[PDB]
C-alpha cells in the first residue's frame, strides 16, 4: 500500500533562457531565475514570451537544452523523461517520446523559430553549447563526431539536447553524450536529424 493523497507529481520542464543565434554573435540569455523556475515547474503555467531556436530548459535538478526543428521542440529522454513542458495555457504533454532513441518532443512554443533539417551531407559540423560556444566537430559516423579541440567534459555539461549544425546552419543532430577519456571529451554522440524526421513522418 501507500498514502495516495500525499503522492507528489513531477514538475514540468521549464524554459529558463535561450541561446541567441540571430545576430553575428552567439550568446546565452536568461529569461527566468531560480525561484520563478521552481514555481513554474509546479504550476506548468509559463506566460513568458519565447523566442529563438535553442531553448535553455530546466527540471528540478538539471539544466540543459532543447532545440526546435520542424515545429517540434526536441530534447533528450535521459534529461526530460516523460515530463510535460510549461506553457501559457498550462502543462503540455509530449507529442513524441522514444526512450530507445533517447528522444522526446513537444509542440514548439508560439514565438519559437525552427531549424530546418540538413540536406547537404556535409561532415563539417558545429555544436552549439549551453554557454553559447560554437564548437567545430568533424562527423565520424551516423551518430558520432570528433571535437577538433578536445575539452574537459565539464565544457559539455548542460549541452544535451542542443544542436549540431552544418555550415549552412541546418540541423544535423541533437547532442546526447560525450565520449570521454580521463575526463577529456574527444568525441560526441548525437541523435541524427533523419531519426527525428522518421519519428515525425
Ligand atoms: C547531458 O545530458 C547534459 O547536458 N547533462 C547535464 C545535467 C544537465 C549530458 C552531456 C554530457 C557532457 N549527457 C550525458 O550525461 C550522457 C547521458 C546519455 C545516457 C547516460 C548519460 C551519460 N552521458 C554521457 O555523456 C557520458 N558518456 C558516456 O557514458 C560515454 N562513455 C565514456 O565516455 C566512457 C569513458 N570511459 C570508459 C567507458 N566509457 C558513452 C560512449 C559511447 C556512446 C554513449 C556515451 C559521460 C561520462 C557523462 C560524459
Ligand atoms: Zn546542411
Numbering used by the authors: 980 to 1180
Authors' text:
The HCV NS3/4A protease – a chymotrypsin-like serine protease – is a prime therapeutic target that cleaves four known sites along the virally encoded polyprotein. The NS3/4A protease also hydrolyzes two human proteins, TRIF and MAVS, which are part of the innate immune system, thereby confounding the innate immune response to viral infection. In this study, we report that four chemically representative protease inhibitors – telaprevir, danoprevir, vaniprevir and MK-5172 – exhibit distinct susceptibilities to the protease variants R155K, A156T and D168A. To elucidate the underlying mechanism by which chemically diverse inhibitors bind to the wild-type protease and drug-resistant variants, crystal structures were determined for 16 inhibitor-protease complexes. These complexes include wild-type protease and resistant variants R155K, D168A and A156T each bound to telaprevir, danoprevir, vaniprevir and MK-5172, with resolutions ranging from 1.10–2.50 Å; S139A protease variants were used except for telaprevir, which requires covalent bond formation with the serine 139 for efficient binding.
Telaprevir lost potency against R155K compared to the wild-type protease, although the crystal structures of both complexes were very similar maintaining the covalent bond between the ketoamide moiety and the catalytic serine. R155K, however, lost interactions with D168, thereby disrupting the electrostatic network spanning R123, D168, R155 and D81, which is important for telaprevir binding. These rearrangements modulated the charge landscape along the protease surface, disrupting interactions with the adjacent P2 cyclopentylproline and P4 cyclohexylalanine moieties of telaprevir, consistent with previous modeling studies.
